Amino acid sequence: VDGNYSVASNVMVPMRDGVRLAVDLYRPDADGPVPVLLVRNPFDKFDVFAWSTQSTNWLEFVRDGYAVVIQDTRGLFASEGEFVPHVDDEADAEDTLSWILEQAWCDGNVGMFGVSYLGVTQWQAAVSGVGGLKAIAPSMASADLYRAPWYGPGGALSVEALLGWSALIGTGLITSRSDARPEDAADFVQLAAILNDVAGAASVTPLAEQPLLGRLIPWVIDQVVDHPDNDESWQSISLFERLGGLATPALITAGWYDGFVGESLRTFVAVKDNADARLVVGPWSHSNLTGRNADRKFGIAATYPIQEATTMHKAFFDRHLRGETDALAGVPKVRLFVMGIDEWRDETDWPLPDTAYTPFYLGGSGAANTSTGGGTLSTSISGTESADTYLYDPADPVPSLGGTLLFHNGDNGPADQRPIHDRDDVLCYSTEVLTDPVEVTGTVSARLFVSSSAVDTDFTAKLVDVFPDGRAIALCDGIVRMRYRETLVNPTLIEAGEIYEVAIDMLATSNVFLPGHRIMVQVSSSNFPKYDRNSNTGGVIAREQLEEMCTAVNRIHRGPEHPSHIVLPIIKR
Incomplete structure (x- = not known):
């Protein structure tokens, strides 16, 4: 029948x-x-x-x-x-x-x-x-699996993804258990505590020390946390x-x-x-x-x-x-x-056939720090050589808000960014208010000229659609852990003060910035817990103690000689 x-x-x-x-x-x-x-x-x-x-x-x-x-x-x-x-x-x-x-x-x-x-x-x-x-x-x-969901194209650990998933699987492992154990009750409580505050769980240092998760699923540490480089252990499970x-x-x-x-x-x-x-x-x-x-x-x-x-x-x-x-x-x-x-x-295809990969250059008068700074975005190269500087302190990272979060507040992708627009370590660059729509559909990336006082640090870039009413809605973002600027496989440190041109893979999006809106980009050196915090030491990040980490004075260079910009996949129809 x-x-x-x-x-x-x-x-x-x-x-x-x-x-x-x-x-x-x-x-x-x-x-x-x-x-x-x-x-x-x-x-x-x-x-x-x-x-x-x-x-x-x-x-x-x-x-x-x-x-x-x-x-x-x-x-x-x-x-x-x-x-x-x-x-x-x-x-x-x-x-x-x-x-x-x-x-x-x-x-x-x-x-x-x-x-x-x-x-x-x-x-x-x-x-x-x-x-x-x-x-x-x-x-x-x-x-x-290294590129998603455990680490990423930038070489930073997606710590909230790791802890959240480990807790979920851990819960399943206990449930699948043949015979209930005396500790199961307590463990269930502990796993719930992680899920209710993933950022808090991700804030412990050394990070590698996971009494609960490491016990329930040794793989979390033995494989993921212990292998920050995209080495053979990863390439073995990559398809x-x-x-x-x-x-x-x-x-x-x-x-x-x-x-x-x-x-x-x-x-x-x-x-x-x-x-x-x-x-x-x-x-x-x-x-x-x-x-x-x-x-x-x-x-x-x-x-x-x-x-x-x-x-x-x-x-x-x-x-x-x-x-x-x-x-x-x-x-x-x-x-x-x-x-x-x-x-x-x-x-008919992806990327879209008619994609114009267009550079939007960072510029502006004065410092671009905060949303009230003078940072601008323009299809024209900046005429004056300038630089924006900020202090990145691992103890106070920029909080993750929306984006591609999985377990830590992962139900609000297009999050309003105003709550963190105003931190001195969040550099903002925006176009003037648009009078004509601009469609950005395709892969997105940034190329920034940067320098640091440390031998290693991170640089982040986030694309945002600013609405007339004030909402600054997140679209896509990426990060680059400097030691992996050239390769995720064989990392090398950087020299303090030296200017490097680095690429930041910001994944992809499809958005029409309508008239009345602005195209905005936020640049910083952290996005926690979407990504773990760079210790700014060049050491094994997951094994370091917060107290032994360093703060870093990071700088973004912009101008004729250092044309930092975001590459937007422009669609014109």
């Missing part, structure tokens, strides 16, 4: 090492084999409501003839084995895909879908040599380099304020030439897909369109798993929510 199905719980699937992973089978009432979709989840396969609202109404797939398999990752909940982040997903994914393909109810076509960790596991599965895998649909995911050689269709979803956005977009660019890649980007943060924020509303149309996403995913799978050549007729290659005008818009 079309539309009907059955569900088999806890089917144990043996891996190559003999360990069995638990899966739930949602199979359509049918005659003959059917295409299959797989979801690998570390947060209990039984708990479908927890993640499904951020993905698709996938039961529609089952009612339409697809079998869906949901699996508990190794070492979690119903699955056997020991849990360790990322390291076993490639092999386990391969063996699971192989098992599915051997089943009487599988017709030889398998696909995958899911969000966050459910997305990262798909890239790990895609790099295996399993021909049966015909397509994937990674949402808010990454193919390079990005292997994406260029694939030919697997991928329906990629991302969010402008999502922690994985930079890497999600990079995966689209990496696979679009060899296979049918699709891209959808909404104005969401990882925990907030409502389209509503404290000081910025994108409209009901901005709410994660789950039914539309379901229809698109089904068409995508019908094309690649069912061979329906015209299933994606009328479906755009790229679909973006363009902020400012706050409208969804179809595109």
Whole structure:
């Protein structure tokens, strides 16, 4: 009977090492084999409501003839084995895909879908040599774990992401525990304390000393905290380099304020030439897909369109798993929510074909410190050589406000920046009030000429849309840890007073700065806890004591000889 199905719980699937992973089978009432979709989840396969609202109404797939398999990752909940982040997903994914393909109810076509960790596991599965895998649909995911979500293109640790995720997984590990332990009660309380004040948890020094998290998940320190360089330990679990050689269709979803956005977009660019890649980007943060924020509303149309996403995913799978050549007729290659005008818009590619990478130079009379300073932005190079200076004290970093925060207040991406506009270590540069709209859609980066009194420090850059009413809404931002200015692999220190030209990867955005608005950029040397604080010593940051860290007198140079600027992807239509 079309539309009907059955569900088999806890089917144990043996891996190559003999360990069995638990899966739930949602199979359509049918005659003959059917295409299959797989979801690998570390947060209990039984708990479908927890993640499904951020993905698709996938039961529609089952009612339409697809079998869906949901699996508990190794070492979690119903699955056997020991849990360790990322390291076993490639092999386990391969063996699971192989098992599915051997089943009487599988017709030889398998696909995958899911969000966050459910997305990262798909890239790990895609790099295996399993021909049966015909397509994937990674949402808010990454193919390079160092770049997202643990560190970043700038070489700074995303400390709030690490502690928050560790606490969440820790909670799951205790819940998945065979027999309840006497300490479980206390630990649950401690984990909650971290989640209620991530910034506070991230403020302890040495940072590497994590009695609770380090005990529940040693990997947090042994791998993440202990490896600040993008060394072999990371390259071993990275999939990005292997994406260029694939030919697997991928329906990629991302969010402008999502922690994985930079890497999600990079995966689209990496696979679009060899296979049918699709891209959808909404104005969401990882925990907030409502389209509503404290000081910025994108409209009901901005709410994660789950039914539309379901229809698109089904068409995508019908094309690649069912061979329906015209299933994606009328479906755009790229679909973006363009902020400012706050409208969804179809595109033929990403980056957009007509992108004018335009430099907007830092300038102005007097000091650019604070929002009331004289800092300006202009497409014209500044005529006078000047410099803005400030003191960066690790004890008092610039608080993270919106952006791509994941766990620490990660539900307010387009945050109003006024609360921190006024710190002396926040340099502000703005255009005059616009009389014509300016669309900025694409990747964003900055190139700054800087100097420091220290042998190492950080430099941050944040793009902001200033509204007529005063709201200074964050768009995208980035950071560069100076020791990694040239490479994330082999860092070198800097010499005090020497001027360096450094690049800051500010990920991406899509925003139309409307008439009456201003384009603004904030420059500083900290953004905590989105990123951990540079100690300004050149030492092992995560192992240093606050008292042994140094303050740093940092300077931004601007003028004819040092044309510091932000590169904006200008779209003119």
